[PDB]
Structure 1
Amino acid sequence: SDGYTIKPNKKVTYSALGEDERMIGFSYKDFGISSSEKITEVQVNISANKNIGKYVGQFGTSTTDSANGYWAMGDEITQSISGNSGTITWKVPSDISSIIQTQYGGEIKFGVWWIDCDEFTIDSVVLKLEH
């Protein structure tokens, strides 16, 4: 196949997150992804009880690269969502995609550096695969 979805229904209140808690992690094992498959894009679908407004954040991922601490982050993303639901997309760079570690507890992390609406729900996280 060409992708996997999880539906965590995870409520997040940005203002209640500590400085060390702003990256929300999901284990790759929850998706059912094979170690043979390469991720090209991650989508986070969110909703709120009011207009979402601006999100600023970054994604991070476990990797197999021991010399770089088994971890990589993507570019900062700024996105404005005008209504009560929307999608944040990370286009994964090829050099990161080639070393993502889905096994042995590897995680994809969704960093929220700011969000105008404060409280929101992560309705789904979608991995899109190279094909």
Structure 2
Amino acid sequence: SDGYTIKPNKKVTYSALGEDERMIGFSYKDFGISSSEKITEVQVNISANKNIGKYVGQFGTSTTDSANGYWAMGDEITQSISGNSGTITWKVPSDISSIIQTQYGGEIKFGVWWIDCDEFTIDSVVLKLEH
């Protein structure tokens, strides 16, 4: 396989999230990914009832590296979406992709630091693979 998709249909209200709630988690087991597979990109497809505007945020993931606390984050992303639907893409660095933990409850986390349109739906999350 070269990719896996989930369709969570998850409604998010940004202004309702507390400080400790601004990362939204998805368990890797929900995708059906094998531990032989290397993730190269993550895409989050979102939609709203009005033009979305700017998103600012970051992705995090469970890892197998205990020295760094079993956790890694990518760089900050700013993306502007001109219409009622769009895609936020994280190109996963090689040094993170090699240690992602898909087993034992590992998660991918979608951090929302700001979004102009307050209410949106996560329609799908897509993992693209290397091999």
TM-score range, shorter chain: over 0.9
Cα offsets for 1:1-35 (capped at 9, x unmatched) = 10000000000000000000000000000000000
Which residue pairs with 1:110 in the alignment? Answer: 110
Deviation at 1:106?
0.1
In 2: Cα distance, 1:118 partner to 1:4 partner: 28
What TM-score does the superposition give when structure 1 sets the normalisation length? 0.99
Cα offsets for 1:91-127 (capped at 9, x unmatched) = 0000000000000000000000000001000000000
Seq. identity, %: 100
In 2: Cα distance, 1:95 partner to 1:3 partner: 20
In 2: Cα distance, 1:12 partner to 1:74 partner: 22
Deviation at 1:56?
0.1
Q: Secondary structure at the match of 1:11?
A: strand
In 2: Cα distance, 1:57 partner to 1:6 partner: 20
Q: Secondary structure at the match of 2:36?
A: coil
In 2: Cα distance, 1:16 partner to 1:122 partner: 16
In 2: Cα distance, 1:86 partner to 1:7 partner: 15
In 2: Cα distance, 1:66 partner to 1:103 partner: 15
In 2: Cα distance, 1:106 partner to 1:15 partner: 27
What TM-score does the superposition give when structure 2 sets the normalisation length? 0.99
Q: Secondary structure at the match of 1:57?
A: strand
Q: Secondary structure at the match of 1:112?
A: strand
Cα offsets for 1:44-81 (capped at 9, x unmatched) = 00000000000000000000001100000000000000
In 1: Cα distance, 2:98 partner to 2:10 partner: 28
Number of equivalences: 131
- Structure 1 gaps of 5+ residues are none
